[PDB]
Symmetry: D2
Subunit: 292 residues, 4 copies
Amino acid sequence: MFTGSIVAIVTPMDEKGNVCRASLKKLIDYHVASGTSAIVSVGTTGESATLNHDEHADVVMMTLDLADGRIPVIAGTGANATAEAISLTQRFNDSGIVGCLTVTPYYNRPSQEGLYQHFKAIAEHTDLPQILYNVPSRTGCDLLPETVGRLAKVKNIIGIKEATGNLTRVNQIKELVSDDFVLLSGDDASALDFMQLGGHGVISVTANVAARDMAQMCKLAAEGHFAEARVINQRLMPLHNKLFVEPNPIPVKWACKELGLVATDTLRLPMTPITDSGRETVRAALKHAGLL
Amino acid sequence: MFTGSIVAIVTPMDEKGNVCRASLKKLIDYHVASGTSAIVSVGTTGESATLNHDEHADVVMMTLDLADGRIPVIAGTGANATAEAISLTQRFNDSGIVGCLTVTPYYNRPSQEGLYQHFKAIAEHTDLPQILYNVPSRTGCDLLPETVGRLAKVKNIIGIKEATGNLTRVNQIKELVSDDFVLLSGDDASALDFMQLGGHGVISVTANVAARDMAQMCKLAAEGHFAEARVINQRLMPLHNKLFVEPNPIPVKWACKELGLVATDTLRLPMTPITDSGRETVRAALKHAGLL
Amino acid sequence: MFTGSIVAIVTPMDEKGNVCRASLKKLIDYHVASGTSAIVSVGTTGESATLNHDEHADVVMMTLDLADGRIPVIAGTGANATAEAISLTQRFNDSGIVGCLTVTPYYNRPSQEGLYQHFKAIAEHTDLPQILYNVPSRTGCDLLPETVGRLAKVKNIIGIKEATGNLTRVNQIKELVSDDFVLLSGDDASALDFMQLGGHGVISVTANVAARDMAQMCKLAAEGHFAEARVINQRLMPLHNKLFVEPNPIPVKWACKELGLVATDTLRLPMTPITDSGRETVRAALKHAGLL
Amino acid sequence: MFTGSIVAIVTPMDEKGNVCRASLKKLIDYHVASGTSAIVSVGTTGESATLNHDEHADVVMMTLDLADGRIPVIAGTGANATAEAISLTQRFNDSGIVGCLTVTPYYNRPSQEGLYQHFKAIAEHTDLPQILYNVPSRTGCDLLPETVGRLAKVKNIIGIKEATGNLTRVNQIKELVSDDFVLLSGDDASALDFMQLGGHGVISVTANVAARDMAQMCKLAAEGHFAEARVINQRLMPLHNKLFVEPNPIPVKWACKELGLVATDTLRLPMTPITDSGRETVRAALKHAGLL
Ligand SMILES: [K+]
Ligand SMILES: [K+]
Ligand SMILES: [K+]
Ligand SMILES: [K+]
């Protein structure tokens, strides 16, 4: 559902840069078998940036189709134009998705009032649950706790993917919102800390390749067994860091390929193939994780 | 030119959020009368973010028609997917624009090699002169001097709009590029300094409302009359700062309207109307510039 | 001892800027009565910066004398010259203090290896327990977890006052050190979070004026009653922030004065009297805390 | 002068960590022969941090004697307590030094008003010309242009050593001060740029080992021959960078020794001997400068 280990799933491509269905199916089967709570489809790790909205929609539909009710699917729906965000959302009305992950507008750097108006308008024109998404390092702006608090009063704004890696934000946000509001980490390396502070889960890059460990860890964290969760986390930590040694999803797509989870590690420009140096850092991380 | 004062022109809109031709014509006549060297159409200040590519192309073509051979027009062509950058650039091939202003991919944060491959592919699918554009605060990435040097070796990559505010870049880039590679400021408050270090002009937001002073100031600069240029700069400096008191282009659109240069200060969400406190700030800066 | 609520105690001065004994006595009595675990004497809040080592020693001796065994006293001993650090430490051999709080060298910005050698040398030439102190915002350098880990193997380096407000440091450090090693917050605003993540206490500015609440909160945190601790913390939070509205200890010394805890709020230059604006922000914080 | 190339001279030490007179004399003769404009004695590069005030005064007086009227000598007088700044400055009153270099209080992070009161009190207890010194990365505080403007109104406050690396400050300060207030770079890698914007010279670490080129370069700059100056700057640029490959003055001391300019590269803890990897880096930069 909207807690636990949620995978920010790669969009597996062939050598032409087109979605590879066979590979997506394997990945979905892998997640159903590994205890992953939900799949975020065509988020950042999903290369939302370089799929056009038609392809973005296909991949979501294909993901849902392959999932076949076995695992909930959340659609990435973010756009830096509110009209575009709205209109992309409509595309997934009645699709079967359980909700949407919607990023703060990138590049144009709106005010807090602007972010409020953006997200309120989007929530207005759908019945689907909305997860807010904050990642200033990508977007150039920062959705502050106060504004999260105003937006949480809207019926179908139900949570936030907090990707700052600033852990003070957990309780600043939490004080300000009801206990039903979901607090999910968007930063693998600090996600166990995030959960220990009161977070409910993680929308994860690491889960693409360490699905089971991430699921166990997140469940331990929810039960208060932090010591036990850390042991897993310790072992995943090089992966938490080195999946970003080169721009996400370059490392993780290579990792999937190396595990045999996807046929090719192809991406679309401006993402470029992994360097040999990166190959060697990632492979070492995988082995530390015990995955290789 | 690709020297002197270049306006990053606002896209004036009617109350419905669509381009207002009467207001655009006024603006262009003004820049023609004021001695502005060129117009950048649908760059950041032109709200590229909230126009779709058709609307963007319409505004560019409308601007070109209205300019009527009197002043060169540079098309904003930025896009964070390389395929989309190519496709948008292709819309203007054999159109009469004199060049493209193309920004580093935002949000997806490519490597330097990715930046290289992005812009190289773009350059290769056009005869148009290309001006690179670096604005890390909006994009999440930083096109370093070295990559600039690499890209300057491509025939139709002929300049950079440097919006970091970091003046050390002028001479870092200069030493690595040829004598005729153009260096333009993207930061009004430091543009004169930029020019004094060896930059060749500015793509300016301030020029929207103080086109005459800006053209004056850059002429002085090119002729090496910096003390003189500097008297104008201090006249404009509060505008250089306070045009960003709220997110650009919210302040400059209000200022245009106030100066009677455009009919309405309407913008597209997620940009929001200027606050009362913001009006008063901007109006003060305009008084200081001698424009009210 | 070296856990719980530990006060970074002000050095109360008269109008000549000289230690006011009557005021220090009141403060010490207040801490013994309020359940404060220990007193840090002549730390940062204690104006170590502007007391010469002779005065620094007096204040420590006078604090110990007034405490009269009722409350443990830790001496600030930090110096950016290792010889000086050593020699200042010798001054407190057999004094009665239970330990020393020693800051990373300020201004000169040594390497990690330098910090290792600094702290190892100091620990060598005393039997007293040493608490490391990291606060990059003041010092210009950052003692990283890895180096904390090497230093924790030295017998009498027993803990760290981590003042970064970066909460990822708690478990990075903790993984690397034995379970006996003490992890204390040096940042009031994030101290409950710090403790929730595995910290043992706080060396606190807020404790100067909210001794009892801070003691209760820290004890709740140690017992795992985080929800109950947060309620207190919520009420102290404006104080956690506004005691730094102007440079520490300007606000807190004024606060003490306003409570009647000290006779004058005098400081030594380059610390300057509180502004009226600051007066009003602090008084509001105190009232929110219920202290006024 | 207080213009041209000014060396921030190393305090050469014997193997015991005490000033080595033979080596200091060599250094001074070299600067006299090389055309260095003035010597700053016991500034940051001179290890002010690890010398007590007597030792500091001894080195200053020794430097003055050895200079023997051949080259002006500026005493480092910084101190984070105002009383100590006054007392150290008083040691040099009627000594033959031509001015003091006095840094913003480090560690205690005063307000702008505190900075004002600090330096004003200092100026008032001496007839010596005072050069302000801003280096936020070491001190934790930033003396803004406006406060500089305020302080320039004091008679014996006559200049600033600006070590931010932020070139915008040259013209911000300049507009607020009188025509004869001196602006010196504190950042070798940007000093030529600093000068091209209107700065009057540099207090340099590079000049320790490339005194001749540095003096050449600043002459060219003052005469407005920037292209020419710039050929020298690129010859020195790897040294400008790699002299900080490890904490200053670890690299420049090793380089002096290597050039036979001093007997030993010994420093005081917490500064540590240069790493093997550091030697090789620095030696490379020296080869590039044409000095090996
Ligand atoms: K809600
Ligand atoms: K070119
Ligand atoms: K130990
Ligand atoms: K003066």
